[PDB]
Amino acid sequence: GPLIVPYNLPLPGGVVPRMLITILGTVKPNANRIALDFQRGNDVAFHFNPRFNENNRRVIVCNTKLDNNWGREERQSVFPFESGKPFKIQVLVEPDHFKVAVNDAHLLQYNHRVKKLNEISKLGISGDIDLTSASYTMI
Numbered sequence: 001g002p003l004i005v006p007y008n009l010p011l012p013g014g015v016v017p018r019m020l021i022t023i024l025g026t027v028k029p030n031a032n033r034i035a036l037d038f039q040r041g042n043d044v045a046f047h048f049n050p051r052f053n054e055n056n057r058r059v060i061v062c063n064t065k066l067d068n069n070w071g072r073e074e075r076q077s078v079f080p081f082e083s084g085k086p087f088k089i090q091v092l093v094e095p096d097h098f099k100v101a102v103n104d105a106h107l108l109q110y111n112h113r114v115k116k117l118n119e120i121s122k123l124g125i126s127g128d129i130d131l132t133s134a135s136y137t138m139i
């Protein structure tokens, strides 16, 4: 069944438009956080961070970390995750943005702040999940 969390998925030669990343898992009961970290070495090109309790609200925080400094957050109040339930996250790399769908519904787009797509060569998956599968394909 499981993969180990935190999990590091290599993206050989980085990301490219038409690359589809699929993450299957189950949110733990009483989850606090999920994080996907697309990394360019020490930098986080794209941090996708559902928070289950931020001041008693559920919010998705997206950001970029450059030279160990976080940038301007992009916050999404649409929250498709539920504690205890199975999910599917799909991240489709497009020319201008990452497109995220959860459970086959469009959730958000994140404009590319890191422009060297071919150097975004690691996805880190962490937080309060049982991880089932993490894979990529070209569509």
Ligand SMILES: OC[C@H]1O[C@@H]([Se][C@@H]2O[C@H](CO)[C@H](O)[C@H](O)[C@H]2O)[C@H](O)[C@@H](O)[C@H]1O
Pocket (backbone or CB within 6 Å): 047, 049, 061, 062, 063, 070, 071, 073
């Ligand atoms: O932006 C994304 C980052 O956010 C920080 Se928390 C962050 O702290 C800021 C003050 O340093 C502001 O309060 C932001 O609102 C808060 O989300 C998290 O510790 C980090 O893991 C990451 O998710």
Ligand SMILES: [Cl-]
Pocket (backbone or CB within 6 Å): 113, 114, 115, 116
């Ligand atoms: Cl760059």
